[PDB]
Structure 1
């Protein structure tokens, strides 16, 4: 077919040679040479840290870790809330080819253990508030030999800070500017090990190459940001996640000022947009919903604001438009991306906005929609499973080749598990499963509504509502239910409960199938297709 495969255009900035650490080192060094160039600004404490300070500390950490004994056979974990220190160990490791595994700072000790059990780090960089948890985790992971405090100058509770640690290992006469970052295979050397649906979170190994490709996107006038002097971004998204991770590294390449927030607050956010003359703001999905409700925006001079982005998270046409209207902008930038694709592979092009579209295939990439049955490449405006192929796809899940293979096929295509379609202009649309609708004899009911009702019951922990196909009525509303531990409930009780809450048209006639876990998709949304499958297989 050929024409049925959407390809991203030629990048504005060619993919450059070198490892991610080399490209980062090169970029930051030139910025460091210009005194006063701001790298990060903490909106809460108002402190600015320049590229010179950042470059020098990162280079010192790279050398110190090298001297300590870390190389490509090692991994480090960075567990911290967004801060001015966050990227210091990240850059240092990338400079020497040590894999960085960002651990979610609000992970309870159990999720924390799982993540690090996968990453197996030799050294752990942590913020003061994450120390206790990390120590408890260390007891269970013998590979963790050294803990280093990020947000401290002097030692802290018997542990070295990044500063004292550096001093303990740098050779005499060390020159930050004479330092040369390690050179290595950008394809086999892992840069980041990020945490990902159903089951326990996995480790996504991302080779230096994916970051290198990302750096091209970052400065693309159409798919990223034009490198203009005095560009400031307000990032409230977590650094340990792909959205925050890969947007920031790109910003560092572009020499932008990254204003950060680790705790959301309405007034502080808007005042920051104003005072720091922010051009782009990055928000997590639920914060878009929040701003659609905000009535304080008009009180601030946001003349410089041009972009509000969602990264790899798709947004409903309603929420996007609501937010854009509130901020008096023609639209918002969204895109589709997975941890497994490094960052967004479908992005809203500058000047090429289209209502309801998630965006277009990014340079270096190609995407298609395939038949859920035949697996054959579908055509224009035809809905099927989104598959993508490009140099930013992960190398695989750490120590889980089975899961890798179930996601990435022989031809390099990653099966997203999400349904979408592209139009005559190559704009993609992600089918919102929340808008799916079940039709009982013409009457329509949103699965989300019934789920809201089920989740409302003291005995129900989780629920997934999907339409059990029925020839005599179109569809019968049914649900897979995960009971709260220790509680007992019958299908009848559940059905009767639903009935006492909805119109005779929205009754759970399809019935209930008790499952231990409701099937989720990589997006982090319920998987209607699997729920349907379970319901069918169970009902004779």
Structure 2
């Protein structure tokens, strides 16, 4: 079947050893070099590779001394902090599965998530502690809570350093610690949760094989960023999520200084780029809005920035092109993936550009686009459901065989739930989620196409589009809009503006509501249910 698109061979073959073994090898190299691994952009606190490696080894030993066995479970519950990856790496080193969560989860989300992954120990931020204590009342198998981002014991709980000290012999040498080899294709490494699900979070099981595949991509000269220890990268994405998890772990294999930024005011954003000489960043779409509007770019030395990427959610082609132009860059790089594919499986290849494209199939992967009804493969320039296959496919959901069966078909293809197409040169374009398409008469209108038009308006800061029920037409496209400060548009002004830019079918017949915040998930995807609820309310 010539409709299947097959990715190339990676420049760097997948290395032998577990994901823990590989991380240890590279971290040790950068440790001896004296490089910095993590920097908190706002405080300027650094962890060297040497310190991060030492603590990760010491925590690995501590978890073994505590009694955790291969295929045990720990969790994190934390907003981004520079300590976040210590329990992750320790788990990978010893073959204990790690379930990351964020403090920003609701209690309903967190109780469900941790109830599925069943961690023995939770590494909680100070901020997340109250939620973890509450969850423990239901998930009563959580034995121990350790405070991740405190140097001292906190509210009666051991901090990370205390837990390590209490579970390792005095004078324990990290250099002596051995990574634990595992059955790479079978051994769960991480239990992850997607963002923007319409239901409660499922536990996505990712293996060591999944992760070491990512390590090849991450440092690939075409599909990643080349090893360059000391080079700084800015990161803004949530660490608990696959997007932040596998970009960050990849950056550690690359030897980069991971500059973690948690505040997105333009001054701090720009000052961070300048002060740490950041050479690249992967943004989410809302951060592009800040950069397109900024009147301050000229005040900062931004000359070190040679790459801007995007992922997680649809990016307006025109907004991306404007921002790339401001920075005098050829274009915005992009990656597209799902929690269930570990990381990005379509990435813009260096040297092989195409306006508006999401990129090309990554090494070791295959992709196809199927007809929504027949499920048969399609040629180029035909919209259908993107499906993918390759060694980053998850092992399956935790204790949910039905959901696994629905996602990964009898022929081993993962059905992404996304609409897209590929062109004659095999560039893929991801349009939107199938579930988001607005059923206006016989049309299937992608909200992202309307959102792009809205975002391009200089008075519109943010927008989200969804379908308003309608007896005659099925669904009418409607929009929720956040206006830029000091600007005003009426509903009619927005509707007329959109009508001037789109087909008749795409008009905002469902109307426009103005809000302070567009409802979205943790990595920028529009919350359709929430938008529909807002549109339902009378003005």
Checking the alignment, whether the CA contact within 8 Å between 2:30 and 2:49 is kept in structure 1 is yes
Structure 2 partner of 1:307: 307
Identify the range of structure 1 (299-308 vs 281-290) with the bigger mean alpha-carbon deviation: 281-290
Q: What are the within-5 Å matches in structure 2 for residues 275-424 of structure 1? A: 275-424=275-424
Structure 1 partner of 2:7: 8
CA distance in 2, matches of 1:438, 1:227: 47
Q: Deviations over 1:489-532 (max 9, x none)?
A: xxxxxxxxx99x978986969xxxxxxxxxx9x9945899xx9x
**Post-superposition offset of 1:230:** 2.6
**Post-superposition offset of 1:480:** 10
Structure 2 partner of 1:236: 236
CA distance in 2, matches of 1:37, 1:466: 56
**Post-superposition offset of 1:162:** 1.1
Q: Deviations over 1:394-421 (max 9, x none)?
A: 1111111101100101221001121211
Pick the structure with greater CA Rg.
1
Q: Deviations over 1:197-231 (max 9, x none)?
A: 32212111111111100000010011100112431
CA distance in 1, matches of 2:335, 2:347: 4
- TM-score under structure 1 normalisation? 0.83
CA distance in 1, matches of 2:419, 2:508: 27
Residue 331 and residue 24 in structure 1: after superposition, are their counterparts in 2 closer, same or farther (change >3 A)?
same
Structure 2 partner of 1:160: 158
CA distance in 2, matches of 1:526, 1:156: 36
Identify the match of residue 111 of structure 2 among 113, 124, 127.
113
Checking the alignment, whether the CA contact within 8 Å between 1:288 and 1:323 is kept in structure 2 is yes
Structure 2 partner of 1:487: none
**Post-superposition offset of 1:79:** 1.3
Q: What are the within-5 Å matches in structure 2 for residues 146-157 of structure 1? A: 146-157=144-155
CA distance in 1, matches of 2:322, 2:270: 17
CA distance in 2, matches of 1:272, 1:12: 32
Residue 135 and residue 421 in structure 1: after superposition, are their counterparts in 2 closer, same or farther (change >3 A)?
same
**Post-superposition offset of 1:303:** 1.1
Structure 1 partner of 2:89: 91
Structure 2 partner of 1:459: none
Structure 1 partner of 2:180: 182
Structure 1 partner of 2:50: 52
Task: Give the number of equivalent residue pairs.
Answer: 484
**Post-superposition offset of 1:276:** 0.9
Structure 1 partner of 2:467: 464
Unaligned residue ranges in structure 1 (runs of 5+): 453-461, 471-475, 482-497, 510-519, 532-540
**Post-superposition offset of 1:280:** 0.7
Structure 2 partner of 1:478: 475
Checking the alignment, whether the CA contact within 8 Å between 1:315 and 1:334 is kept in structure 2 is no
Please give the root-mean-square deviation of Cα atoms over the aligned residues, in Å: 3.3
Structure 2 partner of 1:222: 222
Residue 174 and residue 202 in structure 1: after superposition, are their counterparts in 2 closer, same or farther (change >3 A)?
same
Checking the alignment, whether the CA contact within 8 Å between 2:381 and 2:422 is kept in structure 1 is yes
Checking the alignment, whether the CA contact within 8 Å between 1:232 and 1:276 is kept in structure 2 is yes
Identify the range of structure 1 (339-348 vs 173-182) with the bigger mean alpha-carbon deviation: 173-182
CA distance in 1, matches of 2:477, 2:430: 24
**Post-superposition offset of 1:326:** 2.4
Residue 507 and residue 47 in structure 1: after superposition, are their counterparts in 2 closer, same or farther (change >3 A)?
closer
SS of aligned partner of 2:123: strand
**Post-superposition offset of 1:140:** 1.2
CA distance in 1, matches of 2:334, 2:508: 36
Matched, 1:72 2:75: no
CA distance in 2, matches of 1:7, 1:313: 24
CA distance in 1, matches of 2:228, 2:446: 49
**Post-superposition offset of 1:30:** 1.8
CA distance in 2, matches of 1:218, 1:507: 41
SS of aligned partner of 1:33: helix
Structure 2 partner of 1:141: 139
